[PDB]
Design a protein around this ligand. Structure first.
Ligand code: HEM
Ligand SMILES: O=C(CCCCCn1ccnc1)N[C@@H](Cc1ccccc1)C(=O)O
Length: 453
């Protein structure tokens, strides 16, 4: 009836609550206190955060709700344009790029990307094989080396060579700093003052860097004529069956920037959290390592063998359950409608799906919801509708889901085949928030099982 709402700060409404280093975790705590739905107001805007499967299953009804761009996504659109993740469903370029790119992201496409994924995965294993006795691994940093290199190579046949360096690539410097400006711009009480003029000049400089670098990648490929098995070739050559049109070079650039963001720390976060949960749950690690040793019987894994890593796949889903690295998505009501028989919404009203809190709904998962139990995922039919949404919803779901899960299953399987792991610091989980999530400072030691490649 009277929708719950967290504490307000006069004319700033709830905005100061997101002036925090960990806003998603702060919102999760508000959900703990207020329940399945709460209103969140800022100057000139309002949304409603949903946390229960009961309400989110209705929000996922595409006849009633469509994808909205959150304030964060609207700011990211300043450098991802009408790429797939920041276009509205009704923009011509969304359905056009969706139709063109779907065959590039299917399981059949993964068979083609597999060899390049193995290339990078072997580089990761060789790095760890070559560490000296007393040394340790910085898990998120090395996982980000893996995922960035993989999307660079599979995306446009470019070698970031992240395992050869510590200084970030110039593109990544600007990309990370652009995303940082989005974070700072959100939790600005007075974001219009001229005190942020430098931040805005730097922001425009970083957009130009990303545009210039990707634009020349596209120009270089058209000039060379090479037809590699990557996303850029498919975008240069594909035609939308509906309109009959190809993507233009500007939109191709937006897609590439989008893929680079998604394949960076959003994807590496899944691997980082998965390894964290494995080392914190030794019986689960042992079961996953037993599968890896049984299935990965060749020096280089095949595509088919990765598909046979069923338990590793469940490990990844359970890591996505507890700490999904794209932690929210936004919706708007297409028409007047009533949520859950109790909350009337008007056309245009916005919703936020708080994914980590949805995934803690005890009415779905039981009381042991904080425990890491991959066996929860043995049967998708036993999971209620819309209870598990780490890849979003409907036609606006993650197009990269098969790509992320294939590269994650491949390298996690290889990690489990080749090394025993030690939580040598008894690492205390500390989740750093950018626009994604990562276990900050997570370190392990890896002792080789001395299995050759
Ligand atoms: C663990 C890794 C990933 C997670 C958790 C994830 C999560 C998500 C989520 C929740 C959405 C829906 C966003 C919304 O509704 O606003 C989404 C959309 C999208 N993702 Fe991912 N993603 C991952 C990896 C990737 C990768 C590797 C790529 C590409 C190389 C990618 C490309 C996209 C695109 C293009 C969309 C927009 C799809 C559309 O609306 O047509 N993602 N992702
Ligand atoms: O998590 C999400 C959905 C992710 C969509 C962004 C692009 N992408 C990343 C992985 N696949 C697609 N959106 C957050 C904020 C955010 C913005 C940009 C990047 C990450 C996170 C929110 O709306 O609050």
């Amino acid at each position: 009836k009277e929708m719950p709402q967290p504490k307000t700060f006069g004319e700033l409404k709830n905005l100061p609550l997101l002036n925090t280093d960990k806003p998603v975790q702060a919102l999760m705590k508000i959900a703990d206190e207020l329940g399945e739905i709460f209103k969140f107001e800022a100057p000139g805007r309002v949304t409603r955060y949903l946390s229960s499967q009961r309400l989110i299953k209705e929000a996922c009804d595409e006849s009633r709700f469509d994808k909205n761009l959150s304030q964060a996504l609207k700011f990211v659109r300043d450098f991802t344009g009408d790429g797939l993740a920041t276009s509205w469903t009704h923009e011509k370029n969304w359905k056009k790029a969706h139709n063109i790119l779907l065959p590039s992201f299917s399981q059949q496409a993964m068979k083609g990307y597999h060899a390049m994924m193995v290339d990078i995965a072997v580089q990761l294993v060789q790095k760890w094989e070559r560490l000296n006795a007393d040394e340790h691994i910085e898990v998120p940093e090395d996982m980000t080396r893996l995922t960035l290199d993989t999307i660079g190579l599979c995306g446009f046949n470019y070698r970031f060579n992240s395992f050869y360096r510590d200084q970030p690539h110039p593109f990544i410097t600007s990309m990370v700093r652009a995303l940082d400006e989005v974070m700072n711009k959100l939790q600005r009480a007075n974001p219009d003052d001229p005190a942020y003029d430098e931040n805005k000049r730097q922001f425009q400089e970083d957009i130009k860097v990303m545009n210039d670098l990707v634009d020349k990648i596209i120009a270089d490929r058209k000039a060379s004529g090479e037809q590699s098995d990557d996303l850029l070739t498919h975008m240069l050559n594909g035609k939308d069956p509906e309109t009959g049109e190809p993507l233009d070079d500007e939109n191709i650039r937006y897609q590439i920037i989008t893929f680079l963001i998604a394949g960076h720390e959003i994807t590496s976060g899944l691997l980082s959290f998965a390894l964290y949960f494995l080392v914190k749950n030794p019986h689960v690690l042992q079961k996953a390592a037993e599968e890896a040793a049984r299935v990965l019987v060749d020096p280089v894994p095949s595509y088919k063998q990765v598909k046979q890593l069923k338990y590793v796949g469940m490990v990844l889903n359970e890591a996505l359950r507890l700490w999904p690295t794209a932690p929210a998505f936004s919706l708007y009501a297409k028409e007047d409608t009533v949520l859950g028989g109790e909350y009337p919404l008007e056309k245009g009203d916005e919703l936020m799906v708080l994914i980590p809190q949805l995934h803690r709904d005890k009415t779905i998962w039981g009381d042991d919801v904080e425990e890491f139990r991959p066996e929860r995922f043995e049967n998708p039919s036993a999971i209620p509708q819309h209870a598990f949404k780490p890849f979003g919803n409907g036609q606006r779901a993650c197009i990269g889901q098969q790509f992320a899960l294939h590269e994650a299953t491949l390298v996690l399987g290889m990690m489990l085949k080749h090394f025993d792991f030690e939580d040598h610091t008894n690492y205390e989980l500390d989740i750093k928030e950018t626009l994604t999530l990562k276990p900050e400072g997570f370190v392990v030691k890896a002792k080789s099982k001395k299995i050759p490649l």
